[PDB]
Amino acid sequence: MSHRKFEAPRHGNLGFRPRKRAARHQGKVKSFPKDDRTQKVHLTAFMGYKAGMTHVVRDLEKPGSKMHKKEIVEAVTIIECPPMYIVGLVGYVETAQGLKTYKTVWAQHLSDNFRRRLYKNWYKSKSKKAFTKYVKQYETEEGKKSIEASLQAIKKRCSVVRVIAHTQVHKLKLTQKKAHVLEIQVNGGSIVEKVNFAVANFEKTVNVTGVFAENELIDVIGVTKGKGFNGVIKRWGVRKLPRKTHKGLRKVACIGAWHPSRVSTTVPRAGQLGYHHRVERNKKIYRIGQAQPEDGKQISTGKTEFDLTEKTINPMGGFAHYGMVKHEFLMLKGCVAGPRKRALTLRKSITTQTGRAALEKITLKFIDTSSKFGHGLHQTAEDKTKYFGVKKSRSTKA
Amino acid sequence: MSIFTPTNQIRLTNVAVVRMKRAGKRFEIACYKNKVVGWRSGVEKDLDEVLQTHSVFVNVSKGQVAKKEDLISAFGTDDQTEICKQILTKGEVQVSDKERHTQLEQMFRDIATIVADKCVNPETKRPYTVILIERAMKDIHYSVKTNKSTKQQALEVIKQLKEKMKIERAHMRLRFILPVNEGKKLKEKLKPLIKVIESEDYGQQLEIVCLIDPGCFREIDELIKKETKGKGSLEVLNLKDVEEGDEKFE
Amino acid sequence: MATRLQYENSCDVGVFLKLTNKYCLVGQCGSKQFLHTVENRLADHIPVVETSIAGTRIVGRLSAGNKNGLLLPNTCTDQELQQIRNSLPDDVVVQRIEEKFSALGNCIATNDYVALVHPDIDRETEEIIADVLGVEVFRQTVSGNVLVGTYCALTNQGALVHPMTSIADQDELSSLLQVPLVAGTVNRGNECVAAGCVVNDWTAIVGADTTATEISVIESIFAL
Amino acid sequence: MSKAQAVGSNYRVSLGLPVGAVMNSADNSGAKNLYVIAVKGIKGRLNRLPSAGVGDMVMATVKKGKPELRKKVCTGLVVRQRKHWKRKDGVYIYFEDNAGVMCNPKGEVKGNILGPVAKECSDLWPKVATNAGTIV
Amino acid sequence: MKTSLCNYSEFKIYPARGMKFVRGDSKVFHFINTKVESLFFRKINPRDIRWSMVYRRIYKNTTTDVSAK
RNA sequence: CUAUGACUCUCUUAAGGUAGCCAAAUGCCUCGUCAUCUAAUUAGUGACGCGCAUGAAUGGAUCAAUGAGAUUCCCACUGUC
RNA sequence: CGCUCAUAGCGACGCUGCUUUUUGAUCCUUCGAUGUCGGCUCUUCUUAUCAUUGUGAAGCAGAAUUCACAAAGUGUUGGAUUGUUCACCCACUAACAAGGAACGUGAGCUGGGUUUAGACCGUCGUGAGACAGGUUAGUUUUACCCUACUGUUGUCAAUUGUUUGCGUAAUAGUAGCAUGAUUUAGUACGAGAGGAACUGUCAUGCCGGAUCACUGGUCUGUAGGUUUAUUUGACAAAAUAGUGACCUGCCGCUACCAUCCGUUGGAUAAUGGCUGAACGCCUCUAAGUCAGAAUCCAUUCUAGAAAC
Work out the minimum CA distance from C54 to partner chain A, whole angstroms.
10
Report chain D residues whose CB lies below 8 A from the CB of C101. Answer: 134
Among A283, A309, A280, CA closest to A362: A283
E69 touches chain A (CB under 8 A): yes
Whether A28 sits with its Cβ under 7 A from any strand G atom: the answer reads yes
Q: Which helix (H) or strand (E) holds C169?
A: helix C167-177
**CA–CA separation, C212 vs C182, rounded Å?**
17
- Annotate A337-368 with b (16+ C-beta within 10 A) or e (fewer): bbeebbbbbbbbeeeeeeeeeeeeebebbbbb
Cis before A357? omega within 30 = no
Among A169, A73, A161, CA closest to A128: A169
- Annotate D3-35 with b (16+ C-beta within 10 A) or e (fewer): ebbbeeebeebebbbebebebbbbbbbebebbe
**CA–CA separation, C221 vs D1, rounded Å?**
34
Give chain D's domain count: 1
Residue C170's beta-bridge partner residues? Answer: none
Q: Which helix (H) or strand (E) holds C36?
A: helix C32-40
**CA–CA separation, D59 vs D113, rounded Å?**
18
Give the sheet arrangement for strand C204-206, strand by strand: C2-4, C204-206, C197-199
Of all nucleotides in the shown strands, which has a C1' nearest the CA of D64?
Answer: F74
Q: Which helix (H) or strand (E) holds C109?
A: strand C109-110
* Distance from residue A259's CA to nucleotide G100's C1', rounded to whole Å: 12
Displacement of CA A283 from its chain's centroid (Å): 11
Residue contact A66–D47, C-beta within 8 A: no
Of all nucleotides in the shown strands, which has a C1' nearest the CA of B21?
Answer: F52
Among B33, B27, B31, CA closest to B46: B31
Residue contact C101–E2, C-beta within 8 A: no
With a CB cutoff of 8 Å and minimum separation 6, the contacts of D89 are A71, A72, A73, C55, E1, E15
Of all nucleotides in the shown strands, which has a C1' nearest the CA of D73?
Answer: F39
3-state secondary structure chain A: CCCCCCCCCCCCCHHHCCCCCCCCCCCCCCCCCCCCCCCCCCCCEEEEEEEEEEEEEEECCCCCCCCCCCEEEEEEEEEECCCEEEEEEEEEECECCECCEEEEEECCCCCHHHHHCCCCCCCCCCCCCCCCCCCCCCCCCHHHHHHHHHHHHHHHCCECCEEEEECCCCCCCCCCCCCCEEEEECCCCCHHHHHHHHHHCCCCEECHHHHCCCCCCEEEEEECCCCEECCHHHHHCCCCCCCCCCCCCCCCCCCCCCCCCCCCCCCCCCCEECCCEEEEEEECCCCCCCCCCCCCCCCCCCCCCCCCCCCCCCCCCCCCCCCCCCCCEEEEECCCCCCCCCEEEEEECCCCCCCCCCCCCCCEEEECCCCCCCCCCCHHHHHHHHHHCCCCCCCCCC
* Distance from residue C170's CA to nucleotide G133's C1', rounded to whole Å: 76
Q: Which helix (H) or strand (E) holds C86?
A: helix C78-87
CATH code of the domain covering residue D110: 2.40.150.20
Q: Which helix (H) or strand (E) holds E55?
A: helix E53-58
Report chain E residues whose CB lies below 8 A from the CB of D94. Answer: 19-22
Whether D69 sits with its Cβ under 7 A from any strand F atom: the answer reads no
8-state DSSP, C127: H
User: Do residues C109 and C64 lie in contact, with contact meaning Cβ atoms separated by under 8 Å?
Assistant: yes
Considering only CA atoms, give the Rg of chain B: 28
A67 touches chain D (CB under 8 A): yes
Work out the minimum CA distance from E26 to partner chain C, whole angstroms.
5
Residue E44 domain boundaries: 1-69
Compute the 3-state secondary structure of chain E and give helix, strand, coil in percent, each to the nearest 5: 20, 15, 65
Give chain E's domain count: 1
User: Do residues B5 and B87 lie in contact, with contact meaning Cβ atoms separated by under 8 Å?
Assistant: no
Among D7, D8, D14, CA closest to D86: D14
3-state class of C214 per DSSP? helix
Whether A395 sits with its Cβ under 7 A from any strand G atom: the answer reads no
Among all protein residues, pick the one whose CA is nearest to the C1' atom of G191.
Answer: B231
**CA–CA separation, C33 vs C49, rounded Å?**
16
Pick the CATH number of A83-206 from 3.40.50.12780, 3.40.50.720, 3.60.20.10, 3.30.1430.10: 3.30.1430.10
Find the closest chain D residue to A67 by CA distance.
Answer: D88
Among C163, C224, C208, C211, CA closest to C14: C208
The CATH code for residues C1-224 is 3.75.10.10
Q: Is A242 exposed, middle or buried (0-12, 13-18, 19+ CB in 10 A)?
A: exposed
Residue E4's beta-bridge partner residues? Answer: E13
With a CB cutoff of 8 Å and minimum separation 6, the contacts of C117 are C107, C108, C126, C129, C137, C138, C139, C140, C148
Find the closest chain C residue to E29 by CA distance.
Answer: C100
Half-sphere exposure of B154 (CA within 13 A, CB side): 18
With a CB cutoff of 8 Å and minimum separation 6, the contacts of B98 are B14, B16, B33
User: Do residues D90 and E15 lie in contact, with contact meaning Cβ atoms separated by under 8 Å?
Assistant: yes
Residue contact E15–D116, C-beta within 8 A: no
A377 touches chain E (CB under 8 A): yes
Give the sheet arrangement for strand B92-94, strand by strand: B64-65, B57-59, B26-31, B16-21, B92-94
Considering only CA atoms, give the Rg of chain C: 16
**CA–CA separation, C90 vs C215, rounded Å?**
34
Nucleotides in chain G near protein beta carbons (<7 Å)? 3, 33-44, 75-79, 85-86, 90-96, 98-106, 108-110, 113-116, 132-133, 140-141, 148-153, 163-170, 173-175, 179-184, 186, 190-192, 200-217, 223-225, 237, 247-264, 299-304, 308
Residue contact D96–E23, C-beta within 8 A: yes
Nucleotides in chain F near protein beta carbons (<7 Å)? 28-31, 33, 37-40, 52-53, 75, 79-81
Among C51, C208, C211, B129, CA closest to D2: C208
* Distance from residue B2's CA to nucleotide G111's C1', rounded to whole Å: 12
3-state class of E59 per DSSP? coil
Q: Which CATH architecture does the domain made up of A1-43+225-273 adopt?
A: Irregular (4.10)
Q: Which long-range contacts does A391-394 make (Cβ < 8 Å, 24+ apart)?
A: A391/E50
Residue contact C101–E28, C-beta within 8 A: no
Parse chain A into domains and list their residue ranges: 1-43+225-273, 44-82+207-224+274-398, 83-206
Residue E23 neighbours by CB distance under 10 Å: 13
Among all protein residues, pick the one whose CA is nearest to the C1' atom of G91.
Answer: D38
With a CB cutoff of 8 Å and minimum separation 6, the contacts of A334 are A53, A74, A75, A76, A77
**CA–CA separation, C140 vs C118, rounded Å?**
7
With a CB cutoff of 8 Å and minimum separation 6, the contacts of A183 are A90, A162, A163, A164, A165
Report chain D residues whose CB lies below 8 A from the CB of A4. Answer: none
Among E31, E35, E28, E37, CA closest to E11: E31
Work out the minimum CA distance from C28 to partner chain A, whole angstroms.
7
Residue D131 domain boundaries: 1-136
Find the closest chain D residue to A239 by CA distance.
Answer: D47
Q: E-assigned strands of E1-69? A: 4-5, 12-13, 20-22, 28-29
Displacement of CA D99 from its chain's centroid (Å): 7
Interface test with A, best of D7, D9, D46, D48 (most A CBs within 10 A): D46
Give the sheet arrangement for strand E28-29, strand by strand: D85-86, D92-95, E20-22, E28-29
Whether D82 sits with its Cβ under 7 A from any strand G atom: the answer reads no
Q: Do chains B and D meet with 3 or more Cβ pairs nearer than 8 Å?
A: no
User: Do residues B216 and B116 lie in contact, with contact meaning Cβ atoms separated by under 8 Å?
Assistant: yes
**CA–CA separation, B196 vs C40, rounded Å?**
59
A352 touches chain C (CB under 8 A): no
Half-sphere exposure of A42 (CA within 13 A, CB side): 21
**CA–CA separation, C105 vs C39, rounded Å?**
22
Residue contact A70–C28, C-beta within 8 A: no
Residue B161 neighbours by CB distance under 10 Å: 21
**CA–CA separation, C26 vs C37, rounded Å?**
11
Report chain E residues whose CB lies below 8 A from the CB of C77. Answer: 1
DSSP result, C173-198:
HHHHHTS------SSSS-S-HHHHEE
Question: Regarding beta strands D22-24 and D33-39, do their DSSP bridges make them parallel or antiparallel, or are they unpaired?
Answer: antiparallel
Residue A58's beta-bridge partner residues? Answer: A72, A364
Residue contact D115–E20, C-beta within 8 A: no
Positions 195-224 of A with beta carbon below 7 A from strand G are 219, 221, 224
Considering only CA atoms, give the Rg of chain D: 14
Half-sphere exposure of C3 (CA within 13 A, CB side): 18
User: Do residues D115 and D99 lie in contact, with contact meaning Cβ atoms separated by under 8 Å?
Assistant: yes
**CA–CA separation, A277 vs A279, rounded Å?**
7
Interface test with A, best of E6, E14, E32, E49 (most A CBs within 10 A): E14
Among A165, D118, D136, CA closest to D128: D118
**CA–CA separation, E36 vs E31, rounded Å?**
6
| Phi and psi torsions of A72, nearest 5° | -135, 145
User: Do residues B119 and B216 lie in contact, with contact meaning Cβ atoms separated by under 8 Å?
Assistant: yes
CATH code of the domain covering residue E35: 2.30.170.20
User: Do residues A332 and A185 lie in contact, with contact meaning Cβ atoms separated by under 8 Å?
Assistant: no
3-state secondary structure chain B: CCCCCCCCCCCCCCCEEEEEECCCCEEEEEECCCHHHHHHHCCCCHHHHHECCCCCEEECCCCEECCHHHHHHHHCCCCHHHHHHHHHHHCEEECCHHHHHHHHHHHHHHHHHHHCCCCCCCCCCCCCCHHHHHHHHHHHCCCCCCCCCHHHHHHHHHHHHHHHCCCCCEEEEEEEEECCCCHHHHHHHHHHHCEEEEEECCCCCCEEEEEEEECCCHHHHHHHHHHHHCCCCEEEEEEEEEEEECCCCC
Note the resolution in Å, 1 decimal.
3.3
Report chain D residues whose CB lies below 8 A from the CB of A64. Answer: 7
Of all nucleotides in the shown strands, which has a C1' nearest the CA of D74?
Answer: F39
Report chain E residues whose CB lies below 8 A from the CB of A309. Answer: 69
Whether A338 sits with its Cβ under 7 A from any strand G atom: the answer reads yes
Among C70, C174, C177, CA closest to C117: C177
Pick the CATH number of A44-82+207-224+274-398 from 2.40.30.10, 3.50.50.60, 2.60.40.60, 1.10.10.60: 2.40.30.10
In degrees, rounded to 5, the angle at the alpha carbon of residue D35 between the alpha carbons of residues D85 and D63 is: 150
Whether B144 sits with its Cβ under 7 A from any strand F atom: the answer reads no
Whether B53 sits with its Cβ under 7 A from any strand F atom: the answer reads no
**CA–CA separation, A33 vs A91, rounded Å?**
17
